[PDB]
Amino acid sequence: KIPLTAVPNQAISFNAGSSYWKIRLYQNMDMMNADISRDGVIVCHGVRCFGGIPLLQYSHQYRPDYGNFVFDRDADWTLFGDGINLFYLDGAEFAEYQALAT
Amino acid sequence: AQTGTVKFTQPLPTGVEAYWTGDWKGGTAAEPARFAVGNGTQDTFTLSDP
Amino acid sequence: MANYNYIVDTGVIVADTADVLSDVEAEFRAALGANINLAASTPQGSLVAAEAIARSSVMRNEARIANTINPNVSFGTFLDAICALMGIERGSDLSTFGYGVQVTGRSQTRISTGSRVQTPAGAIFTVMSDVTIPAGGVATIDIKSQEYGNIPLPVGNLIIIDGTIGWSGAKVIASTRVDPGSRQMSDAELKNARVNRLAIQGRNSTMAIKAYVSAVPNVTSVNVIENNTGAVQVVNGVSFTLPYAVWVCVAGNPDKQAVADALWAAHNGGTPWDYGATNNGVPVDGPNGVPVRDPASGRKYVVKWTTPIMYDGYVNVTVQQGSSSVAPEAIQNAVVNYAQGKVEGEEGLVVGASLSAFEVAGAIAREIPGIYIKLCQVACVAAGSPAPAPGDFTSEYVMSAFGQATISVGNVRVTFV
């Protein structure tokens, strides 16, 4: 999982899957939005947030061998730490999950 | 059944009309279809055309 | 000059309100002079605030609709995206009623929007006001609070909001019941519908048939093959030039129409169904299996399928007990439950599956180790024939594609030499 807090605008840096990750979370109107960058290089900008679907959409980004990120439910900055969570999945289990998606 | 001919048993009184619903010759006739007209004594008739 | 290219290849950038505020302040400072006053009260400060709010709002709004073709999006755009293929929306209705039952006093009016409750505490409101005849019976119209597909229990009601001398909210089966939709599809079941439809379209001709038929109740096994030629590939299919060949097994086929319905779901649009040269499995019916016309605005169609020829096999086993007690009937139960295939890892005696004494011995060994097996031989013959002689046994019995085997407890005979 990823530790978080209840703040409308935050950013965390962490080292997982033998790679350097940095995520920015911020509210935009109604839905939440995220910005993901790896190894000091930006990846994708302004992805919408939703329950159960992976954050990294396009084929090249999500992995040749890397991992991905999924929210259990729809996000809300007032619920983090209490009943809403973010989880990281590396290659094998993420592929298993993707197969289970269809 | 193959030729689509049906026979009524008793004689038909005058001025009595009947309809049939189903599928015949591969054609659907779900709505009532006029196939027999009472001439007074004849009891043999045939299906209509859907 | 101070513009930021917030639209880039990676996506769209949303900055913080402080940054845009500072940029607008710099713009106006350059516009008028380096020594102007920018506070709320002064008019120029109001202009600053208006400009900052406008810029931030428009930029965020554009960032909201940055991408929509991806099925992640929702709220109307996604609704039409799914409706392009198939999909319903709205579905937020409430079960309006009619023919209510009311016994009250005489010559009085029931006020509109009264309250009604029924035993699990559902809230119901009336619709139109009406007078009561001296007999003591009138018809009412009801409605509820929520936009939900509620169900009314056929029970006498109770009054929440009470008029004068008016009681007995009572049932009647003459009352119309209109089934209401309740926002049946919000945002995620639409995604599930997308997944289901893309799974439906993904499969090829044969695998789709196998998957669809496997879903029917009480079915056990299925065999499907395509000749694709006017010759014999596995069985003598030369009936037509390029048929499609089907064989289905079942534990009774409780729904004769359902298996036709499942088959009718899968037709490739250029291929008939009949197969065989009067040698394969016996078809259920000669000319047709009388399918349903169409659940959705269609006419009569026909489809063909056949079931395998039932068989019965004989197996001889010779065993030495060793140094323990094992019920021979327990061994027979082990073999039989193997035959059906309720042990994991082995499919069982499905259509077009041969049987060998080696596999039976393996099933016995997995079921119970630490025992000695001397000899096991097998035989199989058409159903209904008398019991064959011991010279008719063999190690393995090859079976044709369109045949199916079955083994009973009494058929097998054991020898505890």
Chain A closest-CA separation from residue C63 CA (Å) = 7
Which residues touch C318 (CB under 8 Å, ≥6 apart)? C374, C375, C376, C415, C417
Resolution (A): 3.4
**CA gap C28, C24 in Å, rounded:** 6
A26 touches chain C (CB under 8 A): yes
Residue in chain B lying closest to C298 (CA) = B28
Residues of chain C by 3-state class (helix, strand, coil), percent to 5? 25, 20, 55
Residue C113 tokens, joined: 């929007």
- CA angle at B10 for the pair B6 and B14, rounded to the nearest 5°: 100
Cα separation of C182 and C93, whole Å?
A: 6
Segment (H or E) for C359: helix C357-367
Residue of C44, C45, C51 lying closest to C20 (CA atoms): C51
Which chains are within 8 Å of B by 3+ CB pairs?
C
Contact B/A (≥3 CB pairs under 8 Å): no
Q: How far is CA A64 from its chain centroid?
A: 17
- List residues bridging with A51 in a β-sheet: A71
Rounded to a whole number of angstroms, the distance from the CA of C337 to the nearest CA of chain A is 31
How open is the CA angle C54-C58-C64, to the nearest 5 degrees?
150
Q: What are phi and psi of C263, to 5 degrees?
A: -65, -40
Distance between CA atoms of residues C293 and B23, nearest Å: 10
CB C120 within 8 A of CB C153: yes
Q: Is the minimum CB–CB distance between A102 and chain C shorter than 8 Å?
A: yes
Q: Using a CB-CB distance cutoff of 8 angstroms, which residues of chain C are in contact with residue A44?
A: 10-11
Residue from C207, C217, C298, C211 nearest C256 by CA:
C217
Q: How far is the first Cα of chain B from the last one, in angstroms, to the nearest whole number?
A: 16
Short-list C329, C396, C217, C337, CA closest to C346: C337
C188 CA: distance to closest CA in chain A (Å): 9
Cα separation values, C228 from A45, C232, C240, C400, Å? 51, 10, 10, 20
User: How many contiguous H segments (helices) and E segments (strands) does chain B have?
Assistant: 0, 6
Cβ(C98)–Cβ(C143) below 8 Å? no
Q: Is residue C380 within a helix (H) or strand (E), and if so which, with residue range?
A: strand C372-382
Cα of C189 vs its chain's centroid, Å: 12
The Cα–Cα gap between A70 and A36 comes to 13
In whole angstroms, give the CA distance from residue C220 to residue C224. 14
**Chain A hits for C195, Cβ within 8 Å:** 101-102
**Residue C394 structure tokens:** 């063999």
d(CA C319, CA C412): 14
Chain B residue numbers with beta carbons less than 8 Å from the beta carbon of C293 are 23, 28
Q: Say which of A43, A46, A101 has its CB closest to residue C12.
A: A46
Task: Identify the closest residue of chain A to C194 by CA–CA distance.
Answer: A102
Structure tokens given for A9: 């605008």
Closest CA to C301 of C309, C292, C310: C292
Q: Which H or E run contains A72?
A: none
**Is B4 in contact with B24 (CB distance < 8 Å)?**
yes
How would you label C200-234 residue by residue, b for 16+ Cβ within 10 Å and e otherwise?
Answer: eeeeeebebbbebbeebeebbbbbebbbeeeeeee
Q: Does residue C349 contact residue C288 with C-beta atoms inside 8 Å?
A: no
| Helix (H) or strand (E) segment spanning residue B46 | strand B44-46
**In Å, how far is A17's CA from the nearest CA of chain C?**
23
C contacts of B23 (beta carbons < 8 Å):
293, 299-300
Q: How far apart are CA C109 and CA C340, in angstroms?
A: 71
* B-C contacts at Cβ under 8 angstroms: 7
Q: Look at the block and give the residue holding tokens 């202009």.
A: C47
A92–chain C Cβ distance below 8 A for any pair: no
Q: From CA C350, how far away is CA C405, in angstroms rounded?
A: 8
Query: What 3-state class would DSSP assign to C177?
Result: strand
Which DSSP string corresponds to C141-162? -EEESSSS-----SS--EESS-
Q: How do A19-27 and A9-16 pair as beta strands?
A: antiparallel
State the burial class of residue C305 (Cβ atoms within 10 Å of its Cβ: 0-12, 13-18, 19+): buried
B11-49 b/e with 16+ CB inside 10 Å = b?
ebeeeeeeebeeeeeeeebeeebebbebeeeeeebebee
Quick one: residue C172, left, alpha or beta (phi over 0 = left, psi -120 to 50 = alpha)?
Answer: beta
**Closest CA–CA distance from residue B37 to any residue of chain C (Å):** 28
Is the Cβ–Cβ distance between C272 and C244 less than 8 Å? yes
Handedness of CA C238, C244, C248, C253 (dihedral sign): negative
On whether the CB atoms of residues C328 and C295 are closer than 8 A, the answer is: no
Interface check B26 vs C, CB under 8 A: yes
**Residue in this structure with the two tokens 């999945």, named with its chain if needed:** A89
Other beta carbons within 10 Å of C338: 21
Integer Cα distance of C75 and C82 in angstroms: 11
Which residues does C contribute to its contact with A (CB < 8 Å)?
Answer: 8, 10-14, 16, 60-61, 63-64, 66, 70, 72-74, 188, 191, 195, 198-199, 202
Residues A29, A36 contacting (CB under 8 angstroms): no
- Tell me which residue of C182, C192, C180 sits closest to C87, measured CA to CA: C192
- Give me the amino acid identity at C338: Y
**Residues of chain A found within 8 Å of residue C78, distances taken between Cβ atoms:** none
Q: Please indicate whether, in this complex, the C-beta atoms of A43 and C61 are within 8 angstroms of each other.
A: no
The residues pairing with C312 across neighbouring beta strands, listed in sequence order, are: C381, C406
- Does C contact A via 3+ CB–CB distances below 8 Å? yes
Question: In this structure, which amino acid lies at residue B43?
Answer: D
* Nearest-angstrom CA–CA distance, C21 and C35: 17
Cβ of residue A73 closer than 8 Å to a chain C Cβ: no
Q: Give C37-106 as a 3 state SS string.
A: CCCCCCHHHHHHHHHHHHHHHHHHHHHHCCCCCCCCCCCCHHHHHHHCCCCCCCCECCCCECCCEEEECC
Residue C287 Cα, gap to closest chain B Cα (Å): 12
**Would you say C143 and C126 are in contact if contact means Cβ atoms under 8 Å apart?**
yes
- Which technique? cryo-EM
Q: What are phi and psi of A13, to 5 degrees?
A: -120, 135
Q: In terms of C-beta density within 10 A (0-12 exposed, 13-18 middle, 19 or more buried), how is residue C325 classed? A: exposed
Going by C-alpha positions, the residue among C309, C318, C261, C252 that lies closest to residue C282 is: C309
Positive or negative: CA dihedral C278, C282, C286, C291 = negative
| CB-based contact A51 C188, cutoff 8 Å | yes
Query: Contact, C142 vs C155, CB < 8 A?
Result: no
Residues of C in contact with B21 (CB under 8 A): none
For residue A11, give Cα distances in angstroms to A91, C64, C380.
24, 20, 72
Spatial distance between the Cα atoms of A30 and A33, rounded to a whole number of angstroms: 10
Residues A12, A31 contacting (CB under 8 angstroms): no
Do C322 and C372 meet the contact criterion of CB atoms below 8 Å apart?
yes
**What would you report as the CA-atom Rg of chain B, rounded to the nearest whole angstrom?**
11
**Which chain B residue is nearest to residue C299, measuring alpha carbons?**
B28
CA distance A83 to chain C (A): 20
Residue identified by tokens 């060793």 is: C322
SS3 B23: strand
Query: Which of A46, A48, A50 shows the shortest C-beta gap to C14?
Result: A46
Structure tokens at C291: 């399918």
Residue C413 at interface with chain B, using a CB cutoff of 8 Å: no
Residue with tokens 């596995």: C234
C299 in B contact zone (CB under 8 Å): yes
Distance to chain C for B15, nearest Cα, Å: 33
Question: What are the distances in angstroms from CA C232 to CA C67, C206, C277?
Answer: 54, 19, 11
* Closest chain A residue to C7, measured at CA: A45
